[PDB]
């Protein structure tokens, strides 16, 4: 009459897992190890706020594109996929992708004046403007570099020097104007044959303008090509030119520790913190895998092409 | 065995008795705790062993750097294939394992009991034994924590 | 058990009886089908979970790009090592698993039968039982689909 | 007397599998998941026929090497490891590996005349030939570019322009002649100092010839260096030169969607289709692994260094 | 079962008898050898399947090649994550397997013996049987290599 | 009365393994598959001794930096992280990282004189020295290249040629001097406008000096930029210059089979052999994994971030 049975727990759970032999097996308790949830925003990366360039490219932001809109540090950079305004005056930026990568994560960053626009005594310092670079509809030009042209039918040779007296590495930018005929060359710079030599303890540069017939971009056929260098503390930079020189005015105090990347994302800031950031939004880093977006920045779960990764913890049901 | 018990709610594996004094459910707290630990400890292993150091991923190349951008993509979705495949299988494999673990534990509980009872109980073949003699609750509670006294009911089955 | 049966051709696991009316082989169609599914479903899992997106592999570098060509080769035969090692082991591991699965299924079939038969049959220890009493084909066919009636032959063994 | 046994199926199967504990275990039924079989031919890649360059390099094919031998689309390109003829006139091709990669998979491709050889009125348009580029043993030269030299002791400055009036991107090629002394420079081009400036909306080029004493290749010590660019629709290309200019005549209508690579293989076409192509032959894509050749193109099984990957499905034998 | 034997030193699995003539330990040399092979063969598999072709790793890039140096690092510690994770788990998984293998082998030895002995021996439930009748060393040595004669002691238990 | 038990072996072993369910489980016998042991030395790589550059960079070693200190073959190269002396005269080395990689593993290497310093009849061959390159405190200069300057107020055009009459590829190095003003240019080389043209069957070079105002390095503001090329057997190299030419004197016989890398390590040689070398020391290659250092050279176990990888072989204890 008297009985004792052996058995196992079951419940109302409807959750299903998979096996290397069977599929859709119902289970008592389960665990999902695939993060598929994001917050649809850009956020701080471990305390350190990102640098979001509204609608500028890194280049335009650095040079001071007038069509564009101080931050002491960032963890990563966010551009849109195609920033509305980049190089207002058509041209080119040398070793641009390397500079972008360098600037990806900056510990300290402070803009400082190194050559005052006023100090140009024998060259016309205030007529290097273009309608391609409008400010409030008036002809302007990148705010951080000076487009020098001739004064009283003459372009004396420039010799300028700057000693890095700061305790920090200095990012210095300059440029060259590629005119579109010989007439424009003499009109602007008098001298038919020009050069720009630039030297530090490591840099040994000599640029020579390229005259060419080019399609108009932003109603300009001439071109501006820009160059950069990092100037170590106590080092000097020596500029020499007899034309086409787009002088520096402002440079940047730089402190680089780690690296990062440039994120392309359409999203906006969310006064928000994460350990792992996505172009589509910030995500939690507890789970070993995620399926949001491959181009993450941070301490991130592994990116996986799965819809569900669920691990059986309980037992079979009834 | 036949199915699980909705009645048993205080543990994973256990017993259901039915004597004169009445019926009852009870969890085998020792084997239930040993199992919960293992399964938990398994899940933790799959989660914590992941290295997850700081990395930054992105397109960093121009129109004349398409070859290296391609090399980047090759390795980028090289690892995507490795991780997907192994995560998919890791789960599928270890689930088979967890469910086998549960069977084993249930049977090893049944088998630990069948040993004590010997011939004086009848293996119904559904996970239950039906005593030829009579079991009070003192009998039942002895079988469960495994302090059963066979030198008592020893002959009555004849 | 001793070996397999060449005679049994209509399934993976099964029975061979021998009474007065004669001998015979028979497959346990339910447990045979459950097993074939699993094994099949396993193989499919190993095959289908492979991602295999479109990729193009080749030497795309010149005499002054030997460093990156080398980086390419490093990752190229980096994955070669990962895949080889894991595919080799995946097979070796899951084979151990499949063969254990087959043992289990064979024993769990034997054990489902031993339960029904109780004491009135003699465990020869080779995978067979030798009835003390006599079994017609109606007896035999009841043991196989598991509708065995012990409340009949119940005493005759004495 | 009466008996019932429990047992398992066995058969005549001789097939062996391996285990993480044992080796060479005989088995009832098995599965091989390693494709090791190929068809020894080059084939279509998902409907789209490959471009097989018999014995030309991509360069020679593009420029119209006379020693070489219309296809509107391809999925991949096949060169031999060392194509018999590449640059008939010795020289160089700029950003060649990038151009190869670009051309790897082309959706549409049509050769069109952009500057007619006849249109050169003040320059000798039909004497830019060499024995290094023989056609039927007669001195010839790449069919798609024109090697202009002086007419009546004079080389006027060239100003030519082409507007992309097509609905498609245009691949344009030109070149420069690097002579081997000053005498040859004046002999051919009159002007001692020459340049070639080339400009689009994105290109800003100025090439200047390099005079050097060089070993003879194909009996020529002078050199031809070639350049390319993609010209967007509605954009213009502006050529200007006073010497050494190897003008374009034919350009290419281009439509690029996906990417692919250039396969080096000695094989031939087989009027044949695949999802995965190998330098050694086409293979089936059902199995998760293969061991043919690492340099595949397509949707390919994983390349693995194994001889046999066999999975036990049946059971042990007797 | 209860624990292991310090006494048993000539093998992995085995027997301890205790009759009139005295006690003794003995290893089951056939099942012990089969197991040692497997475990050994397992370890070898994990070691030998590693491909390990000649490779040279190093920083080969300059101040203006930081992007590719980064691509190098990404793949370099991409594989570091793959290998670490899989090696960690490979060990953890196969250890579970080895220890399950040892249980199975011990029980399958016990179960091969319980079959022969039938009812004339008493399952103490600790891994031992206590004979109702008497066993000389000729009895004992027959049980171990499995040549046991039940058609002798067959009735004495009554 | 009589009993027979079934049981399993146990011993004094204290060793612990881990499981995907439990942790710190004691075990009878075990196996460790993680090599964590090294010999703290640099060693031969499969018979072939490494080239250890004591405190030179590859560049300085090749050019014959006087501040620096014959080996026919090596398997790999060892520099310190920051070699004390690199380019004694400040400057630059073109395609340096590629040359380093090329030289990583050399089967045969023999220095040979190709242009004797004595043979310079119309140019001053023995005054190209600097205090930046001191030998025993006396002004010297890279031993393998000749810094030619003017003789009797004149710098005739140089025309030199070398035919590779050896059975082996030849590594040839030369350089250019970038002075710091026009005055120095005429002081040293007379001619205000100079060039250096260099040509083989594959090389087509024309270098032109860059005058710039530079920070002093090693008390010199001028610069030396170096170039290399591989000269195939039977090919010739043709140098032509009218100034700033840093001529070759010694070149290198080269035989390249395999590749390798350049190891940065502070360690020293140990008269020792390995199959796998580490910046921290040589290691055994039997075990499938190691945790010493990621930057290995050889046939190496996989690098893993683990402290212990131990595999249970025995059984549980008591
Ligand atoms: C830039 O200015 C700094 C600051 O004066 C120079 O550094 C000094 O150099 C003099 C010798 O010329 C020494 O007496 C000091 O010890 C140096 N000061 C420091 C703080 O290092 C530096 O040489 C200048 N750099 C250049 C390239 O002209
Ligand atoms: C090349 O020719 C096209 C076709 O005429 C030019 O595009 C036109 O430009 C004019 C203004 O100059 C506009 O009125 C038309 O709207 C344009 N047509 C089209 C179809 O866009 C084009 O500007 C020329 N490009 C260059 C670089 O000269
Ligand atoms: C460098 O010198 C070699 C050796 O003389 C030249 O090779 C010979 O060239 C002549 C024809 O000019 C042939 O008769 C011989 O068959 C060649 N000899 C060998 C061993 O190949 C070679 O042409 C010279 N190279 C240059 C670039 O001037
Ligand atoms: C399993 O369940 C899913 C989701 O409910 C369903 O879409 C699918 O048809 C099922 N698949 C199989 C193989 O049973
Ligand atoms: C297994 O079989 C193969 C192929 O028949 C044979 O070459 C080899 O010697 C065998 N290896 C082992 C370890 O038994
Ligand atoms: C396991 O043992 C280690 C080393 O003796 C000890 O540090 C640790 O606390 C233990 N961990 C657990 C989870 O028991």
Numbering used by the authors:
A (entry chain A), D (entry chain A), F (entry chain A): 10 to 19, 19A, 20 to 28, 31 to 35, 35A, 36 to 53, 53A, 54 to 77, ...
B (entry chain B), C (entry chain B), E (entry chain B): 10 to 167
Could you pull the original sentences from the published paper?
The hemagglutinin (HA) surface glycoprotein promotes viral entry through its receptor binding and membrane fusion functions, and mutations in HA have been shown to modulate the pathogenicity, host range specificity, transmissibility, and pandemic potential of influenza viruses. HA is synthesized as a trimeric HA0 protein that must be activated for membrane fusion by post-translational cleavage into a high-energy HA1/HA2 complex. Upon internalization, the virus is exposed to progressively lower pH values until a threshold is reached that triggers HA to undergo irreversible conformational changes that mediate membrane fusion.
In contrast, conformational changes by HP HA were triggered at higher pH (∼0.4 pH units) being first observed at pH 5.8, reaching a midpoint at pH 5.7, and being complete at approximately pH 5.4. We also observed the two forms of the B loop, vestigial esterase sub-domain, and F' fusion sub-domain in the two different crystal forms of the HP A/chicken/Hong Kong/YU562/2001 (H5N1) HA protein, although both H5N1 HA crystals were grown in identical solutions at pH 6.6 (0.9 pH units above its pH of activation). In HP HA, K216 makes a hydrogen bond with neighboring RBD backbone carbonyl N210.
